[PDB]
Design a protein around this ligand. Structure first.
Ligand SMILES: [Mg+2]
Ligand SMILES: [Mg+2]
Ligand SMILES: [Mn+2]
Ligand SMILES: [Mn+2]
Lengths: 308, 307
């Protein structure tokens, strides 16, 4: 379809930003607001990381109704079961597992051979399916990985039961036309790649996270991972408000739909910025104090994104 | 040519952001830092706007020697002569003049027939050449203009003496693949198009200013208009530091060069931020506080000027 899945990881990937740690009650209040915003998936945390993380994921899984509650997990049985237990009380639940897939990370960081990396991923996915029909797998460091190896592991995890395959720009140096080509080629090479949802998780190190996200869509991805205000380590993630509004404003070029209530964009941005201490600069798209200072496209009004 | 021209308009387009007006002393100091950074053109102001603006532009023109000093002008005789008088002292000097080229702006704002609009542009560009051989013409509202009219007016001002033609995304809703197509088509359609430098001036209203600028270069543009920290009205301009470091890091894909000293990027960011009161967020590419917490060139913090 033309439906783009918005996967928000403000509460997991965003909260990892220096100084951005949140209390359990702050996470719950942010999770409630993301639900009102209409994001499809709320990644609530990494249940196996500590008792506090488990408790926050679990509390969000007990709060949310209309969005899918996700937990991160390493590709290891015990972490998967932690994830599955934490999200069990949510009516819609996802487990997101990952493993590094690039030659150097595999050999010298994980110290596993490619055969072992595929076997661990398949096993993690199969265990995850005991807990939910909705399982995401990420190829960490995808863009420095061998394309043949990516097609093979993605193929294996699709067969094992993964229904969303996520490709991060781990380093953050990709350029949109290359991102688009990379998606088109990987989807084509992966056994049964047409049968699942492809996801992009882009980084803003060269100011291109949003452009690269949109390029991933043109290449065949239908999920974008992103955060309110682009909150995230280093230069940050793709910012959900920019993605959603590029798609809304230029529906004429993309023809893609989201479930987002755009009137909740500004309240979401303010709430996130207040809680985390990360200010939003004045010239920032959509939610910057100046963005509304002042054809087949749909021009945007300040009110349409929730300015008072 | 694989040289990209970095046109900085922090002191003009940037200055126009609410609250960001700068005194002459502030402008001189930013301008010296922009010269150190190695930008090719410093658009210093709009000389005809007031005597204070004339003085500031002229002060910059007496300061800067290694970069081109530019003034904005409307497409009218008074403004062009004042731009030309104010930049006269600089060894490298440019006048940038402009007119709206869209059906709506021409009919409703200008109240001129397209023919009169061309004639006014041609007249402004000829007078500009009395003052310098280096003249930029912008088609204001280019992306809502009829491409055949753009080709005609651009052909006419090139004949008149414009050597840089600038295409702004005035509304700011362009998408990279469309920006690339648009430049490729316009350059090829314009008479003597190959004789001049084509420029992009992109806006960040959808978060896409930098990507649109890179797309313009893929499309044949060789000048990018940009500002320190993306300073400008609304959601701002393409950020000079992002454009320059995207080109540097991914030189493997672009093969394009600038004369920028990248070690000057963070000093320039901090200075502009201090003087304008426009902070940069922690998660801001290159210059944000957290930014630094294979055929490509990995960026070190020290390479962009972090202490
Ligand atoms: Mg906190
Ligand atoms: Mg000031
Ligand atoms: Mn991230
Ligand atoms: Mn501008």
């Amino acid at each position: 379809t033309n439906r783009v899945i918005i996967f928000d990881t403000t509460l997991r990937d965003g909260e990892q930003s220096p100084g951005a740690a949140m209390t359990k009650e702050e996470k719950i209040r942010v999770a409630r607001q993301l639900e009102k915003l209409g994001v499809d998936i709320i990644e609530a945390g990494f249940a196996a990381a500590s008792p506090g993380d488990f408790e926050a994921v679990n509390a969000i899984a007990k709060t949310i109704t209309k969005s899918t509650v996700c937990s991160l997990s390493r590709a290891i049985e015990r972490d998967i079961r932690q994830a599955g237990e934490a999200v069990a009380p949510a009516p819609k639940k996802r487990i997101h597992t990952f493993i590094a897939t690039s030659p150097i990370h595999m050999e010298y960081k994980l110290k596993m051979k490619p055969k072992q990396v595929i076997e661990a991923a398949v096993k993690a996915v199969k265990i995850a399916r005991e807990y939910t029909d909705d399982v995401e797998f990420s190829c960490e460091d995808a863009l420095r990985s061998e394309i043949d190896f990516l097609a093979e592991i993605c193929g294996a995890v699709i067969e094992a039961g993964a229904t969303t395959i996520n490709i991060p720009d781990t380093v953050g140096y990709s350029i949109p036309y290359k991102t688009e080509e990379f998606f088109r080629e990987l989807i084509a090479k992966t056994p049964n790649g047409g049968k699942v949802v492809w996801s992009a998780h882009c980084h803003n190190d060269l100011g291109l996270a949003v452009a690269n996200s949109l390029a991933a869509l043109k290449g065949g991805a239908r999920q974008v991972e992103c955060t309110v205000n682009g909150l995230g380590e280093r230069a940050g993630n793709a910012s959900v408000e920019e993605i959603v509004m590029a798609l809304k404003v230029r529906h004429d070029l993309f023809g893609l739909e989201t479930g987002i209530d755009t009137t909740q964009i500004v309240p979401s941005s303010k709430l996130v910025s207040t809680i985390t201490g990360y200010p939003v600069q004045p010239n920032k798209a959509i939610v910057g104090a100046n963005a509304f200072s002042h054809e087949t496209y749909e021009i945007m009004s300040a009110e349409s994104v929730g300015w008072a």
